[PDB]
């Protein structure tokens, strides 16, 4: 009836929205990793040059 | 025939849409991975050159 | 002024024309149930297929014997004009055109429409404007012609 054509369908919409939200979270955390890893590597290079 | 055809069809393609969601999420996360790699490598190279 | 009056009269004629005819554009705004018209997501698109009264049996077994996932218990008429009927048929989000082509091979007249309040407001306001403007222009022209 209305229930299996509306409520379950909206829940499937919620599943899809959850999947895309998780994709966004992957993107965001990956970009923050791209920044933080570079930040840590530049210091490693800087100290290596400075010590010598 | 019995209307079980109806449930068969709806469940089949509601699973097809979910696999579509899964594959698009896979593509998105992978592409984010390569973008992460590229940005990190570019920044580290750029700063290391100046340090040297 | 008389040209404007005749323009208003033909506007009234146009407005009254749509009150009679089949269902390809026939209005379903106050006798339409949005609950029988699922819109939240692209999973079951309730197409509005209309047929004359002749093909009752030929249509009633066109969804529940050949179609795919037409939501059961809802494929019937919302309002009948003694000559044509309607049906709240559903189908996929990726194979609408194929089923539409099959129906038009069966020679049905689909009704594609968006449930919007502004449309009903436009209907009411154009009705009122045409009628009132025509009447007031008539009487103002009475004074003007007398003068």
Structure description:
The structure is cut from a larger assembly and holds chains A (52 residues), B (52 residues) and C (147 residues). With 52 residues, chain A is mostly helical. Helices cover 96% and strands 0% of the residues of chain A. Chain A has 1 helix and no strands. Chain B is built from 1 helix and no strands. Chain B is rod-shaped. The relative contact order of chain B is 0.07. With 147 residues, chain C is mainly alpha-helical. In chain C, 41% of the residues lie in helices and 10% in strands. Chain C has a 3-stranded antiparallel sheet with strand order 2-1-3, with helices on one face. The chains are: A mainly alpha (52), B mainly alpha (52), C mainly alpha (147). At the A-B interface, helix 1 of A face helix 1 of B. It is classed as motor protein. Keywords: ATPase, proton pump, rotary motor enzyme, membrane protein, motor protein.
Q: What is the strand and helix layout of this fold?
A:
The structure is cut from a larger assembly and holds chains A (52 residues), B (52 residues) and C (147 residues).
Chain A: H1 2-51
Chain B: H1 4-51
Chain C: H1 2-17, E1 47-52, H2 56-60, E2 84-89, H3 96-105, E3 109-111, H4 117-146
Antiparallel strand pairs in C: 1-2, 1-3
Helix pairs in contact in C: 1-4
Organism (chain C): Saccharomyces cerevisiae (strain ATCC 204508 / S288c)
Subcellular location (chain C): Vacuole membrane
Protein name (chain C): V-type proton ATPase subunit C
């Amino acid at each position: 009836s209305q229930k299996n054509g509306i409520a379950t369908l909206l829940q499937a919409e919620k599943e899809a929205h959850e999947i895309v939200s998780k994709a966004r979270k992957y993107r965001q955390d990956k970009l923050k990793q791209a920044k933080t890893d570079a930040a840590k590597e530049i210091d490693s290079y800087k100290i290596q040059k400075d010590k010598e | 025939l019995t209307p079980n055809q109806v449930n068969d069809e709806l469940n089949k393609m509601q699973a097809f849409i979910r696999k579509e969601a899964e594959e698009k999420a896979k593509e998105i996360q992978l592409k984010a991975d390569q973008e992460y790699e590229i940005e990190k490598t570019n920044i580290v190279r750029n700063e290391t050159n100046n340090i040297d | 002024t008389y040209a404007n009056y005749n323009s208003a009269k033909t506007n009234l004629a146009a407005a009254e024309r749509k009150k009679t005819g089949d269902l390809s554009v026939r209005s379903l705004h106050d006798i339409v149930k949005p609950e029988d018209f699922v819109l939240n997501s692209e999973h079951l698109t309730t197409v509005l297929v209309a047929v004359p009264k002749s093909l009752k049996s030929d249509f009633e077994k066109s969804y529940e014997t050949l179609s795919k996932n037409v939501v059961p218990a809802s494929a019937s008429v919302i309002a009948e004009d003694a000559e044509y009927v309607l049906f709240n048929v559903h189908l996929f989000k990726k194979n609408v055109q194929e089923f539409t082509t099959a129906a038009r091979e069966k020679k049905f007249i689909p009704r594609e429409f968006n449930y919007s309040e502004e449309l009903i407001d436009q209907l009411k306001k154009e009705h009122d404007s045409a009628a009132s403007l025509e009447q007031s222009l008539r009487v103002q022209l009475v004074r003007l012609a007398k003068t």
